[PDB]
Amino acid sequence: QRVTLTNADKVLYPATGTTKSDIFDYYAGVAEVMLGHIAGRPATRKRWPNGVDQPAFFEKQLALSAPPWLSRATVAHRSGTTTYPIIDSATGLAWIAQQAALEVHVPQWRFVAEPGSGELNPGPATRLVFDLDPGEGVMMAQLAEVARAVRDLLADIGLVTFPVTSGSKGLHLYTPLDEPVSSRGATVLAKRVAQRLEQAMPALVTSTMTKSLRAGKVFVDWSQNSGSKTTIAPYSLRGRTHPTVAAPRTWAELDDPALRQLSYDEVLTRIARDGDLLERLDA
Amino acid sequence: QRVTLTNADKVLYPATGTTKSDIFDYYAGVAEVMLGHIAGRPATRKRWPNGVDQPAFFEKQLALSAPPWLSRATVAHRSGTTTYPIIDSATGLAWIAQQAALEVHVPQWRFVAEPGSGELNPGPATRLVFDLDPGEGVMMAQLAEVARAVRDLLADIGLVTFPVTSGSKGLHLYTPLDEPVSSRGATVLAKRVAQRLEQAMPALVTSTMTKSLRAGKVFVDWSQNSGSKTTIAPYSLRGRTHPTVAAPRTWAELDDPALRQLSYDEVLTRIARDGDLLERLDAD
DNA sequence: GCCGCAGTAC
DNA sequence: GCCGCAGTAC
Numbered sequence: 210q211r212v213t214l215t216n217a218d219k220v221l222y223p224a225t226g227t228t229k230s231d232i233f234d235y236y237a238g239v240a241e242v243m244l245g246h247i248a249g250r251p252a253t254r255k256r257w258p259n260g261v262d263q264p265a266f267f268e269k270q271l272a273l274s275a276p277p278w279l280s281r282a283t284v285a286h287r288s289g290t291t292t293y294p295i296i297d298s299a300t301g302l303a304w305i306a307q308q309a310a311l312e313v314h315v316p317q318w319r320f321v322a323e324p325g326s327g328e329l330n331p332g333p334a335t336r337l338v339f340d341l342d343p344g345e346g347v348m349m350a351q352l353a354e355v356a357r358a359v360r361d362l363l364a365d366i367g368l369v370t371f372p373v374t375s376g377s378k379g380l381h382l383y384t385p386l387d388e389p390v391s392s393r394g395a396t397v398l399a400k401r402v403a404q405r406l407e408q409a410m411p412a413l414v415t416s417t418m419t420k421s422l423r424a425g426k427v428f429v430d431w432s433q434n435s436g437s438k439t440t441i442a443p444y445s446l447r448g449r450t451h452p453t454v455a456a457p458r459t460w461a462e463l464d465d466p467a468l469r470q471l472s473y474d475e476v477l478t479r480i481a482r483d484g485d486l487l488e489r490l491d492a
Numbered sequence: 493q494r495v496t497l498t499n500a501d502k503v504l505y506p507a508t509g510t511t512k513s514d515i516f517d518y519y520a521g522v523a524e525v526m527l528g529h530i531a532g533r534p535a536t537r538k539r540w541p542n543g544v545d546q547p548a549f550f551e552k553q554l555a556l557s558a559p560p561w562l563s564r565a566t567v568a569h570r571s572g573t574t575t576y577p578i579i580d581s582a583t584g585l586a587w588i589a590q591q592a593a594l595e596v597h598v599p600q601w602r603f604v605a606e607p608g609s610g611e612l613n614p615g616p617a618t619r620l621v622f623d624l625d626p627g628e629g630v631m632m633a634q635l636a637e638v639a640r641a642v643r644d645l646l647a648d649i650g651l652v653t654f655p656v657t658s659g660s661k662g663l664h665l666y667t668p669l670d671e672p673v674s675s676r677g678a679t680v681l682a683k684r685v686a687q688r689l690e691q692a693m694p695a696l697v698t699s700t701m702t703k704s705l706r707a708g709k710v711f712v713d714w715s716q717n718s719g720s721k722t723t724i725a726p727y728s729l730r731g732r733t734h735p736t737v738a739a740p741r742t743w744a745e746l747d748d749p750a751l752r753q754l755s756y757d758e759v760l761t762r763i764a765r766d767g768d769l770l771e772r773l774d775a776d
Numbered sequence: 777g778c779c780g781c782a783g784t785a786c
Numbered sequence: 787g788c789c790g791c792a793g794t795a796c
Contacts (some may be wrong), residue, residue, distance in 0.1 A: 211676065253782080254781095256781080266780080267781080268779050268780095268781050268782075269781090269782050270782085271780075272781085282786085286783080287783080287784070288783090289780075291782090291783095298729045305785080340796085360787065361781050375794070392704065393705065396616060396704065396705060397705065400702075400705075413521075417715075419715060419718060419795090420794085421675070421676045421679060421718060421719075422676070422679065424684075430796075431743060432700075432796070433796070435702060435796095438782070438784095439782095439783090439796090536792075537791090547793090549790075550791075550792050550793090551790095551791050551792080552791085552793080553791075553792085553793055555791085569784090569792090569793065570793095570794090571793075574792085574793085623786090701784095701785060703784085703785080713786080715786075718786095718794095720793070720794070721786070721793090722792095722793095
């Protein structure tokens with residue numbers, strides 16, 4: 210119900226002196242605007258128990274010693290079943306904080322309660338996600354040009370798109386689906402989009418991961434809309450040198466030549482001032 | 493040089509009762525027709541020492557115990573360094589046979605001696621491969637039809653194409669590049685073909701891997717043209733229930749609604765009649 | 777002290 | 787008898 214934060218004031222990002230208490234407050238701070246974008250969704254963690262200079266690990270399976278109040282659901286998986294935790298409460302974030310789970314990864318679908326059994330099973334996709342990964346020697350304007358064009362192609366079928374600077378290198382774009390659709394269809398559509406863009410912008414865009422083909426291109430990754438993939442949640446910290454955030458931005462911001470990744474402190478100032486840019490993303 | 497056959501007449505394919513001796517003879521049998529298409533290339537092995545009902549493993553790195561007379565070359569693999577065997581003699585396939593390396597996998601480029609060095613490093617692609625992979629529910633007619641469409645596109649840019657039934661489920665197509673192109677360009681080229689094909693045959697053809705999109709469609713895999721990938725060598729045996737083979741075929745055969753995979757004995761007698769159907773492919 | 781703690785493709 | 791025996795992505 211509450212999480213007892215141990216190892217407080219212990220540094221996680223050595224380069225900025227960011228403490229485990231700093232993390233706790235951050236997630237408490239962005240709890241309001243972050244929750245609606247991850248509730249209902251299985252939450253993949255990446256964990257740096259011993260700081261950002263120390264070995265990390267990905268974790269999907271939830272520990273059987275993990276708190277009993279954490280909402281949970283399982284997914285039949287190739288090799289075995291996986292029981293995921295759903296983070297859906299300021300209390301859930303506090304756990305993320307103490308678990309040292311700097312990053313929170315979710316897919317673009319939620320669980321749905323079954324008719325008779327009421328079982329929590331994987332539901333349709335409620336939003337699309339695109340991952341724009343600037344390759345060898347790609348500058349901000351080209352990356353933004355590409356991002357605007359993706360927005361254009363989605364605008365062309367009456368959809369709206371929201372820019373999220375991942376805190377890493379990639380720009381993530383999300384589009385809410387007012388009528389949800391299977392993961393497969395959502396992947397058909399993100400793929401059509403990618404491909405179409407790659408057609409119209411051969412020298413500036415690739416729709417494929419093939420690394421040899423990336424130099425000088427923005428890889429428009431449409432595949433993470435796969436039912437079985439994951440994307441770093443908005444408002445989530447990263448595990449890098451500095452403590453940067455998958456921070457929601459405005460389209461005007463992208464027109465900035467010197468545009469940069471946003472820090473946790475900056476994100477907070479901007480929430481209190483304006484609120485959730487992604488508010489319309491999960492009504 | 494020399495290779496002692498071990499545990500001859502021990503079974504590897506239980507379903508057919510195929511022994512190491514058979515495997516030994518088979519590779520001996522296809523030596524002449526197979527070598528040209530793997531010589532110069534790093535050989536990845538999939539080995540089933542305890543036959544085809546028991547765990548296998550992918551092997552790339554060459555054991556220190558391996559015969560000194562075997563050809564070698566090293567590729568830098570970012571995580572570390574691998575030095576593969578190159579198969580280039582009848583006695584090399586004897587060793588393969590002996591290793592129980594049922595399958596041989598090569599990429600579409602050969603090694604080339606560096607000027608001052610003589611150090612064998614990876615050179616450009618000498619042939620394009622398409623891997624036509626049938627998704628759930630895809631029947632014979634469709635695999636064949638899509639192959640014929642690829643051939644068409646390829647002939648539309650001055651290239652010929654040879655069909656090989658993979659020994660499994662897939663159908664592979666090779667194209668000579670009498671003038672070698674970087675793996676980067678071969679991949680670019682392959683991807684364009686596949687995307688053009690998919691654009692024109694959306695209901696029947698996909699160009700991406702995504703499993704959830706694969707069903708009912710032929711995945712024209714254009715991406716085994718990367719230099720860091722591998723495709724089963726032609727004439728190679730299969731780690732399958734029955735000892736099927738990556739067998740070169742004729743376009744006419746691909747008209748047959750009951751086209752199936754061929755087994756090694758069928759391949760053998762087929763060579764005797766025709767010789768190598770892929771001769772055009774690796775004129776060195 | 778350890779160790780494991782993901783997925784699923786080619 | 788047990789073990790390893792692949793590399794590369796998202």
